[PDB]
Ligand binder design. Structure first.
Ligand SMILES: [Mg+2]
Ligand SMILES: [Mg+2]
Ligand SMILES: [Mg+2]
Ligand SMILES: [Mg+2]
Ligand SMILES: [Mg+2]
Lengths: 233, 212, 226, 196, 125, 204, 195, 222, 195, 196
């Protein structure tokens, strides 16, 4: 049993017709102190998987090393390490899910919420969630922390069920994600303007976008707001 | 819960209710509170349902191993003490158990051992365990005799569970009856309390307070 | 509960879902959360349901008496000031969380009020367990100079976000539109996207199925003549 | 919350962020924490929103009744009324208020009233959760008798840093300028102050 | 200070008359005429707006007052006494009825409450 | 410890075609101990019927209180109180004890004597009105009653059909609750006749 | 205190009440009468927290005796029981509630019927053929359920009461030092001096 | 302090027919007032004509189902591909659950299939392994809303034959698979109306001598 | 369990032990023998937490019986009491201590003397002329202090024991269902079947 | 405690105050919080003195044994050893360590390891109770590739403000300069830095 110290906030994600998108801001908070502004919380594994992690950053870094070690280990005595016997998103997830549940069962959890986003060998979209309790679930849209409350409602308006996935293009999906990130910046006190976004497409592969910013923000209406009730000036 | 067991001329009567509750919610009305350890030994289920179920069928395994090794029926004393010694090892861990280990052997005759998760092991003639135990004790104490017939003893056990089932909110559903003889136990049926109550009320003239 | 308030061109609109719950159980599937403080000042409540209904009636009553005394139509700021000073006095023990909206001779207004007595001004607001789902929609689609038809659309879309995504919210969308120089129009069950499907079976019993002990006529009438 | 008030040559300027949080949820991102108790006596509010609003409303009442009887009150008088409420009700209040005002006789004055209910007259004052991060910056950069433009820059840069580090602070930077000329409201948006 | 008049100012005279009530009725007699007529589908109440000066705006002086949405009142006698009675009548319709039953009082009961206030001014200290 | 579940018991009310029905079990207990099988929880003031679940002392107290208040109401108003009005009275009365409440779950049922409209209403312990069209439930087996009522209920049931629906709703809900049962009563209410029926049920 | 029983038979009400008074470690008395005569045909037994029991019982007694003098009339058992309930119901929300449970056994001279009321410290009143407070009912009610008849004689009621007391003496851990039994009928209140 | 347990809501229902068995469950997965997934399968085919669901805390639920499926596999290895009978599976699950007696799987487990005589069978477990064969068992959030309805409509409790007035009970006539599915659907429709954690979708697994079949139905998504 | 007494007279040790076994609410048994024979001339009575009492007593019994067989010799009461004390003294710092208080009454055949040892669950041993555990001493010791003589006969010891039991039955709140009395002398251990 | 490490053109400089308190009592006013784990790898310690000393001693051992086998370790390697101890023993440690070192290949590097045991490579790092007050100042005044004299002034001014506001910080300002030229210790007394 511990308490999280340096933390990362929402990870948001969704499926679209040819793959998955995942995004997460670059902030490492220290309580209310916005301590670290250059933290990458999307960690790619190979060219077919991106693991998004929120919660305790020290535990994130540990998980990051496990995944790095996993790639090394898979390559051992494996002539098809970059082909048929490459790591799948489903392998990477199941491994993490095992670790998370084992650690909660020893009463010493990795204080995280994780979303594994990727594309399988047969082109199938993979998107599944796991957290410090070892709880797992899959859905056309997945989000951690504040994202669950604010991003999901917006992302679900695009893909409300399984049948909406083939109707959703990468442009529409990315637009919805980027908008959700803006909304989280407005409303999550532990978020930052800077974020990273990763697209894993079955045709165009892994596109990893760094140093993105929330833009097209509405603030002008603030000038007209005065006092808290009766004040006019 | 209400469970009882008493010794008499014709052996042992074991009688239990059938209700299981989680708070005020009635989880089940068809629970088996008599564990059939083997064809000769019976155990009652009060306190922790799992703890009673698990460890008394385990007890059946130990009793089976005993008679394979010793080529002889295990005594009720020995069988009860296997269970009591086991739970005593777990003392503090939070096992919850209140059971009567019932059997009828040559050397002992009809024997009842009250075994407890605190490690208590008591031999006795009449035992009553559960939330409705006090109600069943009343009927038992005032009507019990050693020279009861098997028919009257069975009815007494049934009636004593009914007395508890009526008053105790956490007892009811149905009554399970067993008669333990030297040649083994004999099951004497499941008796719905709802139907039994009205039947007993009319035939016995009891429960005048209740309108039927 | 999901409740929202949205300012527009010539007035303000409030909206709410229609699910009231006791823990995880749905007590009423068509609750009326839009309350009237005065003809053109309406409010929606979240938190302790008795406290919201009770505090709106009390202020609504004192507002009416104040209106009669002053020979002037009631103002939203008066309802606001009376609500907050009452709630503050009770230090949050009255668990009323309100979005107050209305029109008066001063103009159109939109405020929120929290149980400890703090108030806030805004062009768009949301309260309740589905407030985050609703606010996401409001932050995504709100703009300046909304029309009446756009504001109703936005408000109800925000409530829907709560209905679908928040377990504390559900059933229908109630809306009330308060426009300047007009009667406030209360639109009860403006949307009905959660009608229960026909059951597979009828559970009407044969008559005489229930066992009966005694029948008797109950005397509800008064003591009779003669 | 990040709030401050700074005296300068022509008077005084109050500054504040616009973020109000319930835990990690931003309940209001466009809050007006600069509140008016008299024509040229304003205050910055920090702590319990309910408490500081209730206090400010009572003060405004007291200064309105004061004015009806004895004419315009001093900034010191306003600070005393704030103090009286905060001190006497310290057990039931969580309020940190900065009082700033402009007289013609006294010019710009700033009074800070922390949790305890004590009063401290200062050349400038900083308060709220975000103030902790700018004690160093403000102490190094503050000068007395600055110009209006310099003071606006000083507040803008200060609250920019407070907002940058404090998660409880954010949104727009509101300011209110108090001088002989009158009362001027200023607003500065994220795109402006973040790049500083 | 303190209201040291804790005794009745209206008392029975030897003849059994309550002087102050009679004198109050005399003041009513001097007052401007007002009337009421009940029809099958309505009631009408009317009075003269006796303007004290032509410079006065008699529209600002309401002799006929709404008590509840379904109840109205008019008077004859002392205007100021009427005004405060209307204020009390409006409030009592809420405090002793609407805040309890969630509806406005019936005419007879509101009248009863007004009467009670007037009776108390006839006996109280 | 929890005052609303010391004594146990349930009330359910339903609307039908030109009729309402209100029903209750008869059990009073001290937690596990059954104490009385004749503790009726439904009362009436003129033609307005009030069921009350929860802490039994308060059930009794509130019945005596509403008898008191409806009697004075009648003397002054010169007419019997209506369900809609009484509902507001129950709400007012409960909320006046906001910070020291009666631990009860009242249920109003009746037919408006002037409009003939069937009416039911429920409250929490603090006065919040639940005015459902279909049915109101209350007591220690309210969850069970919700389940029964939700599936068994259909609108516009005739009096003698409604009797079967509400009876079966109550009985089977009470049989899944340790603290409810020990007999049951069902009132079938029409505009100018009310029938009261005691049901035969298991006594455990 | 501990055990108080009540049984209403054909023509009388019988109240049995323990004699023990225990101060934690020691039994200070073994002859305590836990009852007060409220009126000639109304008897109230009581059990609960120390001091509160007697204080409450005597307070009720005084009030009923006051009523009896003022009106020159004995209140019905039902009327007395309602008064008592209200006092306890008032008490439960007080600064310091009376922690007292009572049984009211009375003979209604108007209706010519015995009546037994059971009221706990919360003000929970119930009219019963037989009743108890505390753990007493747990041991005794199964016997009373079985044997009780509404047309029992006073002698049969006492015999059923003896059986209840015997069961208590057998299975209760506490020594309650026997019971004082009193009978309430048309002729008034009398004590059974041998039990 | 770290809390190793959570509540993922959900509601499951097992009903044993004469020569069949159904195990149904909603597909909604939740924490607090949020929906995690509108379709997260909860009832699983475990092989050997056995279906299983472990409702409650989904992590323990997934762990248990996984370990049981594993136990079925190893039962085949160790005992010459012998079919694991429903009664044997039930006893095995008891030991899996009781294995963690002092740090339990926070789930209410139900399995369904056919017994060795080909009759319908449902077994019901508590979190620590006490179990029983049952005819009818709802588990999870809306269990209290469903079971009374089933007592009334499956077992015909409190229902008597018209005319006799309480003297003759309604006879316990056998229900077909189509009749059971109606009662399952109506149970979940009603539970969805009155319980916030129930909704989105209903997935039913039907077990017969021919094998395991699946049926899916939409539920209200509010 | 509850009351255990011991008295060493001229030529014997007498142990009196209650017969009641209470499981919270109900008295499950009224004939329980709270004693074990450790050797032909050594008897141990016991009282404390349930399960632990009998488990401990039988464990001691087995060990002394083992010693008796190995050496073909009966340990002196003093030796047995020292062994028992050590086991309890070991127990008190264990993971879960035996919550058991004992009296060891023995007749030393070498010295031709009766011996009574009192040992509590902490391993606090004292040799006494008369002893008790729990609250038993509080009621009885004033009587024993007054009447006891070292040259008492067995019959006089039993009479003084009756007086102690009577005082317990009068002033103790709990019904301990009488006592089983046993005498330890040169001829061994025997039970007084009428007491 | 007020500690910081700043990279610059020629390498890196570590800075620290010298105050160690037990409650409000200054147990040591001349503490050396700049500690050496290798020739040109030092660290700044904050949190439990027992814990950070124990950790530093173990690291020094590990780097001494590393050097015997594999030659001079990198600053990254030293930070990893610090992290391994802090992360794996997070439940029983209260340590906030800044690791600073000079390679010839990598030049000046700074790694901060906060409570959790995470590692963050930064151009500069600030830590300790007094750091909260200089987040604003340090962010506004830090530049990359400063000179030695500029970096000394930056640290001196920063810790001066940290000391001024934080009661837990005080005494002298110690600094250690790490470059190709070698290891230089610097000390600055109250009379010097207070007047800044
Ligand atoms: Mg406050
Ligand atoms: Mg910020
Ligand atoms: Mg029941
Ligand atoms: Mg029962
Ligand atoms: Mg639902």
């Amino acid at each position: 049993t511990q308490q999280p110290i340096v933390t990362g906030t929402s990870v948001i994600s969704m499926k679209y017709d040819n793959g998955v998108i995942i995004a997460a801001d670059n902030l490492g908070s220290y309580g209310s102190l916005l301590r670290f502004n250059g933290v990458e919380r999307l960690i790619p594994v190979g060219d077919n998987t991106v693991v998004g992690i929120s919660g305790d950053i020290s535990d994130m870094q540990h998980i990051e090393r496990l995944l790095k070690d996993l790639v090394t280990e898979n390559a051992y005595d494996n002539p098809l390490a970059d082909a048929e016997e490459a790591l799948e998103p489903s392998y990477i997830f199941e491994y993490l899910a095992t670790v998370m549940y084992q650690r909660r069962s020893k009463m010493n959890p990795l204080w995280n919420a994780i979303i594994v986003a990727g594309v399988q060998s047969n082109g199938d979209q993979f998107l599944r969630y796991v957290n410090l309790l070892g709880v797992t679930y899959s859905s056309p849209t997945l989000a951690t922390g504040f994202g669950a409350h604010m991003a999901n409602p917006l992302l679900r308006k695009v893909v409300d069920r399984e049948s909406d996935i083939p109707k959703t293009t990468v442009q529409v999906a990315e637009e919805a994600i980027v908008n959700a990130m803006r909304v989280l910046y407005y409303r999550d006190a532990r978020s930052s303007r800077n974020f990273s976004l990763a697209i894993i497409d079955k045709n165009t592969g892994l596109t990893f976008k760094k140093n993105l910013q929330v833009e097209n923000m509405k603030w002008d209406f603030a000038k007209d707001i005065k006092g808290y009730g009766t004040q006019k000036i | 819960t209400t469970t009882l067991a008493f010794r008499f001329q014709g052996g042992i009567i074991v009688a239990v209710d059938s209700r299981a509750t989680a708070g005020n919610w009635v989880a089940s009305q068809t629970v088996k509170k008599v564990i059939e350890i083997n064809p000769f030994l019976l155990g009652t289920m009060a306190g922790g349902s799992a703890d009673c179920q698990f460890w008394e069928t385990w007890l059946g395994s130990q009793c089976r191993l005993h008679e394979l090794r010793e080529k002889e029926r295990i005594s009720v004393a020995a069988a009860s003490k296997i269970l009591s010694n086991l739970v005593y090892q777990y003392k503090g861990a939070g096992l919850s158990m209140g059971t009567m280990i019932c059997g009828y052997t040559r050397k002992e005759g009809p024997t009842i051992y009250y075994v407890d998760s605190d490690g208590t092991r008591l031999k006795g003639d009449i035992f009553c365990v559960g939330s409705g135990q006090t109600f069943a004790y009343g009927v038992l104490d005032s009507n019990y005799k050693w020279d009861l017939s098997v028919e009257d003893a069975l009815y007494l056990g049934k009636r004593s569970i009914l007395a508890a089932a009526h008053r105790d909110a956490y007892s009811g559903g149905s009554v399970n009856l067993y008669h333990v003889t030297e040649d083994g136990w004999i099951y004497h049926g499941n008796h719905d309390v709802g139907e039994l109550f009205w039947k007993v009320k009319e035939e016995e003239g009891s429960f005048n307070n209740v309108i039927g | 509960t999901t409740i929202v308030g949205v300012k527009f061109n010539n007035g303000v609109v409030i909206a709410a879902d229609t699910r009231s719950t006791q823990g995880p159980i749905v007590a009423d599937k068509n609750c009326a959360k839009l309350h009237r403080i005065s003809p053109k000042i309406w409010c929606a409540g979240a938190g302790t349901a008795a406290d919201t209904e009770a505090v709106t009636q009390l202020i609504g009553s004192n507002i009416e008496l104040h209106s009669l005394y002053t020979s002037r139509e009631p103002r939203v700021v008066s309802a606001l000031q009376m609500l907050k000073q009452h709630l503050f006095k009770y230090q949050g023990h009255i668990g009323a969380y309100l979005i107050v909206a209305g029109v008066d001779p001063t103009g159109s207004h939109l405020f929120s009020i929290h149980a400890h007595g703090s108030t806030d001004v805004g062009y768009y607001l949301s309260l309740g367990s589905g407030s985050l789902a609703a606010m996401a929609v409001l932050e995504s689609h709100w703009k300046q100079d909304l029309t009446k038809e756009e504001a109703i659309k936005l408000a109800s879309d925000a409530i829907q976000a709560g209905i679908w995504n928040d377990l504390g919210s559900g059933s229908n969308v109630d809306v009330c539109v308060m426009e300047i120089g007009k009667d406030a129009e209360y639109l009860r069950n403006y949307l009905t996207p959660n009608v229960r499907e026909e059951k597979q079976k009828s559970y009407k019993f044969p008559r005489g199925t229930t066992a009966v002990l005694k029948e008797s006529i109950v005397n509800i009438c008064d003591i009779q003549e003669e | 919350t990040s709030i401050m008030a700074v005296t300068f040559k022509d008077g005084v300027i109050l500054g504040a962020d616009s973020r109000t949080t319930t835990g990690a949820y931003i309940a209001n991102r466009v809050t007006d924490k600069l509140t008016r108790v008299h024509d040229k006596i304003w205050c910055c509010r920090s702590g319990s929103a309910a408490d500081t609003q209730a206090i400010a409303d009572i003060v405004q009442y007291h200064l309105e009744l004061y004015t009806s009887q004895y004419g315009t009150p001093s900034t010191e008088t306003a600070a005393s009324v704030f103090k009286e409420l905060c001190y006497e009700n310290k057990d039931n209040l969580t309020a940190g208020i900065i009082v700033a005002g402009y007289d013609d006789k006294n010019k710009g004055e700033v009074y800070t009233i922390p949790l305890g209910g004590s009063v401290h007259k200062l050349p400038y004052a900083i308060a709220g959760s975000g103030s902790t991060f700018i004690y160093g910056y403000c102490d190094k950069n503050f000068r007395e008798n600055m110009s209006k433009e310099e003071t606006v820059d000083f507040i803008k840069h200060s609250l920019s840093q407070a907002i940058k580090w404090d998660g409880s602070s954010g949104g727009v930077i509101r300011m209110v300028v108090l001088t002989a000329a009158g009362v001027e409201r200023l607003i500065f948006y994220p795109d402006e102050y973040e790049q500083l | 200070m303190t209201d040291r008049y804790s005794f009745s100012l209206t008392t029975f005279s030897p003849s059994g008359k309550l002087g102050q009530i009679d004198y109050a009725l005399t003041a009513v007699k001097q007052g401007v005429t007002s009337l009421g007529i009940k029809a099958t589908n309505g009631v009408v109440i009317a009075t003269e707006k006796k303007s004290s000066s032509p410079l006065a705006m008699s529209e600002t002086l309401s002799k006929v007052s709404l008590l509840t949405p379904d109840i109205g009142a008019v008077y004859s006698g002392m205007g100021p006494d009427y005004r405060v009675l209307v204020d009390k009548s409006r409030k009592v319709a809420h405090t002793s009825y609407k805040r309890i039953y969630g509806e406005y009082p019936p005419t007879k009961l509101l009248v009863s409450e007004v009467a009670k206030i007037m009776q108390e001014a006839t006996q109280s200290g | 410890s929890d005052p609303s579940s010391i004594n146990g018991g349930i009330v359910v009310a339903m609307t039908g075609k030109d009729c309402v029905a209100i029903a209750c079990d008869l059990r009073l207990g001290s937690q596990s101990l059954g104490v009385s099988n004749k503790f009726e929880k439904i009362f009436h003031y003129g033609h307005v019927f009030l069921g009350i679940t929860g802490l039994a002392t308060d059930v009794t107290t509130l019945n005596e209180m509403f008898r008191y208040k409806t009697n004075l109401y009648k003397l002054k108003e010169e007419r019997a109180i209506e369900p809609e009005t009484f509902t507001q009275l129950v709400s007012s009365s409960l909320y006046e004890r906001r910070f020291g409440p009666y631990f009860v779950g009242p249920v109003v049922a009746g037919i408006n004597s002037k409009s003939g409209k069937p009416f039911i209403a429920g409250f929490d312990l603090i006065g919040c009105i639940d005015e459902a069209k279909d049915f109101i439930v209350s007591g220690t087996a309210s969850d069970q009653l919700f389940g029964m009522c939700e599936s068994l209920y259909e609108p516009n049931l005739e009096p003698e059909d409604l009797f079967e629906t509400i009876s079966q709703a109550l009985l089977n809900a009470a049989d899944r609750d340790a603290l409810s049962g020990w007999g049951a009563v069902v009132y079938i209410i029409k505009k100018d006749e009310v029938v009261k029926r005691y049901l035969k049920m298991r006594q455990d | 205190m501990d055990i108080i029983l009540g049984i209403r038979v054909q023509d009388s009400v019988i109240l049995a009440s323990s004699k023990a008074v225990t101060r934690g470690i020691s039994v200070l008395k073994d002859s305590d009468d836990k009852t007060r005569q409220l009126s000639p045909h109304t008897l109230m037994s009581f059990a609960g927290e120390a001091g509160d029991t007697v204080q409450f019982a005597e307070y009720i007694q005084a009030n009923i005796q006051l009523y009896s003098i003022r009106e020159d009339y004995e209140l019905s058992p039902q009327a007395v029981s309602s008064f008592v309930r209200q006092e306890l119901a008032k008490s439960i929300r007080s600064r310091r509630p009376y922690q007292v449970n009572v049984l009211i056994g009375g003979y209604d001279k108007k209706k010519n019927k015995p009546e037994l009321y059971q009221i706990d410290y919360l003000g929970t009143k119930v009219e019963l053929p037989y009743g108890a407070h505390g753990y007493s009912g747990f041991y005794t009610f199964s016997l009373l359920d079985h044997h009780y008849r509404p047309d029992m004689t006073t002698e049969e009621g006492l015999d059923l009461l003896k059986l209840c007391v015997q069961e208590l003496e057998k299975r209760m851990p506490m020594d309650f030092k026997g019971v004082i039994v009193k009978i309430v009928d048309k002729d008034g209140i009398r004590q059974v001096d041998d039990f | 302090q770290f809390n190793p347990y959570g509540d993922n809501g959900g509601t499951i229902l097992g009903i044993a027919g004469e020569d069949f068995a159904v195990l149904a469950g909603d597909t909604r997965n939740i924490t607090d007032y949020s929906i995690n997934s509108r379709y997260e399968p909860k009832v699983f085919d475990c092989g050997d004509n056995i279906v299983m669901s472990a409702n409650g805390f989904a992590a323990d639920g997934d762990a248990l189902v996984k370990r049981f499926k594993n136990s079925v596999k190893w039962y085949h290895f160790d005992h010459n591909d012998k079919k694991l009978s429903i009664n044997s599976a039930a006893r095995n699950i008891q030991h899996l659950l009781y294995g963690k007696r002092f740090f339990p799987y926070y789930v209410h487990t139900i399995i369904a299939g056919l017994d060795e005589d080909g009759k319908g069978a449902v077994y019901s477990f508590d979190p620590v392994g006490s179990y029983e064969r049952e005819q009818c068992r709802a588990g999870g959030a809306a269990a209290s809303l469903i079971m009374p309805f089933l007592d009334n409509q499956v077992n015909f409790k409190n229902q008597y034959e018209p005319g006799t007035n309480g003297k003759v009970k309604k006879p316990l006539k056998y229900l077909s698979v189509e009749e059971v599915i109606k009662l399952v659907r109506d149970s979940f429709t009603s539970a969805t109306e009155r319980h916030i954690q129930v909704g989105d979708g209903l997935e039913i697994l039907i077990v017969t001598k021919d094998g395991v079949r699946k049926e899916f139905y939409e539920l209200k998504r509010d």
